[PDB]
Design a protein around this nucleic acid. Structure first.
Lengths: 79, 107, 94, 96, 94, 79, 107, 92
DNA sequence: CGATGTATATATCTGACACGTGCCTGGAGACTAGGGAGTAATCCCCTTGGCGGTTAAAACGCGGGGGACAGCGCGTACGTGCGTTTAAGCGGTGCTAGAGCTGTCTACGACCAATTGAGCGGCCTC
DNA sequence: GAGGCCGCTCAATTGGTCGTAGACAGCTCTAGCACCGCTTAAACGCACGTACGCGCTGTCCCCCGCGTTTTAACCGCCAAGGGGATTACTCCCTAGTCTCCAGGCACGTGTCAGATATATACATCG
């Protein structure tokens, strides 16, 4: 039940960066589900790259490659 | 017999010899011609110089003297051609451009 | 164990565009990943252009066509003239 | 002394659009990452930079999704974002 | 007299049942040739290339009208309006 | 001036296949411009593949590869 | 000399292991191709072909037809929620669309 | 002469529906689908090797590419067919 | 007109950046080999241009009622502020699991050659 | 319109060789994990006030449906020559190799650009 540690204030600050002026009370519980699905898909790919290498440690390159396969390339951790 | 680099003969700063090696070992084709790495290096140098000239002017506008990732994000997202080339890319510590919809401002 | 990087050449370009300015190692790492991205894009499309014509070598025509398919607008126009000016200098310097 | 509703919201928007800091607490996020991964393999270990890469990606995804949501809120003649604006944005984006 | 919109449901059902091309071939061909004249003069077109273009363009437009109709229902309208196209294209990133 | 060859009835049949019941009269001029920009990008790419081959005839495969470049594969014409 | 027996019949496959091995070795994918890779890739391609043709044949029979035509392939691909995920970006010529109307539009 | 998969698609069709024929347009769609998926698998099998400094593509690269690309139940069955084929082949 | 918030100016300092040293592995120069690509000529496919005609489809007017949208009323849900409290963040010590490297070596895949039948293009026909 | 049958040819098979890369075991030292104590930033909770979403009615016009005209899309047949596609000839470009030397990579040093804490000035909101 760690998903509760993505707290309402953090959701508000994220909506502020995106320009949202007013937020309905139901948004937080929907946003946790959307985040959880995104994390699940990325971690499943990262762990598949970790498994193929026979490593036990997950590494930044595994995450950058999982993001690259999925279309969301990230600059500043590798290449 | 005095060696002189192919980049100096081309008038370039990027390494033509490394680009040639990296094409040969990249499994792109079984043959690579002599002119391909000079062209690709000159293109890569052009795009690097455009990015850094804009980033440095963004640093000068903040009265800073060192480029940091924020200045690269400002350099890219304010140019309508670089933003189309780098549309799928996330820059760490980059943040966002300041932007508010006119409907939201005070009446 | 040595790691290759473009750091020196990005710094050389920086000193020409802005002689008074430096760059932090995080921004250098971002630029280093940018060069490798655009390199992989262009080499990929050049290889596809080569195999569509049943040809075996990669030439400056393939690089020029990949650049013309990839870069928008005025970037294409100036990148092409930089490429051909570099090639014509390299061949005339002999 | 009291401000009227929404003025500090605009002040926060300008503040958080000016800054580049990461907005989710680091330690709570690390536990959620570890809780998800143990469904795929047991006794995994994480590099410190792998969790930071995950956090940058998640925040960059959420901010853009809230931008698309806000355009859908304004289209309906509202200023409040609603769950159906999120669902519409997700559906036109093709992820729902 | 059929009441307004009763026939539109039969039309929707008919056009979702069939698979034929809906735009007239000759006008589309002359539009394609008029566009290409800006890139080269004296081009020639294979007969099947224009058919491939017409299939791609009609599939694009039908998908855009699906997104437009969802944007129209979101605003509690039934009638689609130009602002529905611009929103769908804006979320899609065009 | 051949864009007027895409008539109002033709646009209506495409809206009908997409399920649209009612259409405002301003839709036709907007749709014509959207279609024109979509055609312009594909033709530019197909003519680039034609020029590189030193052909003068535009082949169906040039259209298939132009559409593949935008990320929208077409099946039926080969490839 | 032994009487020749095809590798596909050894593996129990219809798809040609020999030509898949040639295409892997002649496509610049890697400098070495191991013996099991083409038997695996051929078994995968046969499974994926059979799963499509089963549903297309069902769609054909349900129209009381006896030949498969592109409409039946489109109906198959769009009526399976996993095939639609593998082929989500693909358009099929003459395929048309799934009959679907938003319930708010119906009387 | 042009190579195609047409006879193998026909063989599989006779395995699944002996009484049912297939038209030439559907046959060309199927040939395109097979060509598209071969390249999608072989590209990721190529990337997986170079990340790990390996110079060979082997059954594990194909298996992991399949796990990455195909959705869940398709992936479970495709792997269970690949392992059956490779053990029937090697143990013969 | 008051006061709250952000902006700018000054003093302090500490660690990230910029410069120099050692050295080794990667690029450069000179040479040989052979097959990929450029040049040229012919065939004959299929693209473009034309003529007739009929009958499907587009264009124009009329009628009318379904639908967009403007103004209004109202009540509850979200933003702002103060006080309590909880666990995030920092510096620190300990340590051992496992990532990264080294040296041995043998099982695998690339390569050459000779043999032959699986698959291609084409014609007939129900 | 798709399937059955024929001639035949070039892509696939079986066999032997050999060079190396990747499988195995031993080593080491990095950094990931677990625990302690303290400060205090941030979260959580309650109160309360008003801006926003929602539903309702009225109205006026602009899409839908129908009837007649009329126009140029479609079918079908005839001409003819531009171009794609193939074969043959041969030259010049890129791969592979050895030698050798200087460019780029770790490692160390040290100082000034940026982070910080305090002061106050002025811009904004009600």
């Amino acid at each position: 039940d760690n998903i509760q540690g993505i707290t309402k204030p953090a959701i508000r600050r994220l909506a502020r960066r995106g320009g949202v002026k007013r937020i309905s009370g139901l948004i937080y519980e929907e946003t946790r589900g959307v985040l959880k699905v995104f994390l699940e898909n990325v971690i499943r790919d990262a762990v598949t790259y970790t498994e193929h290498a026979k490593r036990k440690t997950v590494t930044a390159m595994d995450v950058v490659y999982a993001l690259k396969r999925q279309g969301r390339t990230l600059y500043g951790f590798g290449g | 017999a005095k060696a002189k680099s192919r980049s100096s003969r081309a008038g370039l700063q990027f390494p033509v010899g490394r680009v040639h090696r990296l094409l040969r070992k990249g499994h792109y084709a079984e043959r690579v011609g002599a002119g391909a790495p000079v062209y690709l290096a000159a293109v890569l140098e052009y795009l690097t110089a455009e990015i850094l000239e804009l980033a440095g002017n963004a640093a000068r506008d903040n009265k800073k003297t060192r480029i940091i990732p924020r200045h690269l994000q400002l350099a890219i997202r304010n140019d309508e051609e670089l933003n189309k080339l780098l549309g799928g890319v996330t820059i760490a510590q980059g943040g966002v451009l300041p932007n508010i919809q006119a409907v939201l401002l005070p009446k | 164990s040595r790691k290759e990087s473009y750091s020196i050449y990005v710094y050389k370009v920086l000193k020409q565009v802005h002689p008074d300015t430096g760059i932090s190692s995080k921004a250098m790492g971002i630029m280093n990943s940018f060069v490798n991205d655009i390199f992989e894009r262009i080499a990929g499309e050049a290889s596809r252009l080569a195999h569509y014509n049943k040809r075996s070598t990669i030439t400056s025509r393939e690089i020029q066509t990949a650049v013309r398919l990839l870069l928008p607008g005025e970037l294409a126009k100036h990148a092409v003239s930089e490429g051909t000016k570099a090639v014509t200098k390299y061949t005339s310097a002999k | 002394h009291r401000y009227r509703p929404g003025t500090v919201a605009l002040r926060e928007i300008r503040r958080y659009q000016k800054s580049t800091e990461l907005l989710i607490r680091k330690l709570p996020f690390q536990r959620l990452v570890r809780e998800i991964a143990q469904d795929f393999k047991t006794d995994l270990r994480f590099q410190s930079s792998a969790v930071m890469a995950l956090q940058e990606a998640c925040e960059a995804y959420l901010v853009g999704l809230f931008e698309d949501t806000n355009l859908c809120a304004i289209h309906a003649k509202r200023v409040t974002i609603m769950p159906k604006d999120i669902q519409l944005a997700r559906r036109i984006r093709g992820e729902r």
